Design a binder for this molecule. Structure first.
Ligand SMILES: *CC(=O)c1ccc(Br)cc1
Ligand SMILES: *CC(=O)c1ccc(Br)cc1
Lengths: 121, 121
C-alpha cells in the first residue's frame, strides 16, 4: 500500500516520498512504465515491473506489515502477494536511496510525452 | 487523461499541477478521497466523485480533446464519457483556480495524515 511504500521511501531516503517521487521521471508516480530518465527513474521502473508479478494483492491499497529493524526494512509475512509486494516496495525504497546521488530535480515535476515505450518488464 | 487534466490545471491556475496538486489534502492526488481540508481539496473531492459517476471510459488514461479558447477550457466533442471526463477535469481545474487564494502548502506533499475518510460521492 502507498502508505507503507511512501513510509519505506521516507525511512530509506529521508525524503518526502510524494514530493521527491510522486512525479519523477517516467516511472516514479502516476501512470505506467516508461523509458527511465536515470537510475532513480529506473528504480521505479523496476518497481512497477515487480508490481506486475503480483496477482491477488493490490499494491496501491493493500496494507501489509513490515518493521524498521536496525534501519533496515523487514516485512513480516503477510502471505504470498502481500509479502512480495512489500519486497517490491522495500526494493524500490532502497533503490531510490542508493540513487539519491544522481537524483535530479528537473525530473521532479512531471511530463510524460518524452516518456517513450517501456521495454517489457 | 491525466495529461489533459494536469494541463487544464496548469492553464487555469498557472501552477505546476503535480507539484501543487499531486499530493494535496485528502483528495488532491493519489487514489482515494477523504474529508476535504479546504476548498482546494474539496475541489479534487468533487472531481473524484465526478470520475466515479463516469462510465464507459477511463479517466486516468483516456485521452480526449479540449482546447483553450479565450482563456477558457472548451471540451471537444470526443464522445459522451470522454466529454463528461473532460468536463470533470475542466470543473476541477476551474475550482482549483477559484480556490488559489485559500491554497495552503501545509497540505501539500501531504502524506494523507489524518484524512478522515471517504464520504459517499
Ligand atoms: C512503483 C513506484 O516506484 C511508485 C513511485 C511513486 C508513486 Br506515487 C507510485 C509508485
Ligand atoms: C481529482 C484530482 O483533482 C486529482 C488531482 C491530482 C491527481 Br495525481 C489525481 C486526481
Amino acid at each position: 500500500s502507498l502508505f507503507e511504500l511512501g513510509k519505506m521511501i521516507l525511512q530509506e531516503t529521508g525524503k518526502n516520498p510524494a514530493k521527491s517521487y510522486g512525479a519523477y521521471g517516467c516511472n516514479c508516480g502516476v501512470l505506467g512504465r516508461g523509458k527511465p530518465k536515470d537510475a532513480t527513474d529506473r528504480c521505479c521502473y523496476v518497481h512497477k515491473c515487480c508490481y506486475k508479478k503480483l496477482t491477488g494483492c493490490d499494491p496501491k491499497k493493500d496494507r501489509y506489515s513490515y518493521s524498521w529493524k536496525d534501519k533496515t526494512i523487514v516485512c513480516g509475512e503477510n502471505n504470498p502477494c502481500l509479502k512480495e509486494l512489500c519486497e517490491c516496495d522495500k526494493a524500490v525504497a532502497i533503490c531510490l536511496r542508493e540513487n539519491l546521488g544522481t537524483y535530479n530535480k528537473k525530473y521532479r515535476y512531471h511530463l510524460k510525452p518524452f516518456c517513450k515505450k517501456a521495454d517489457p518488464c
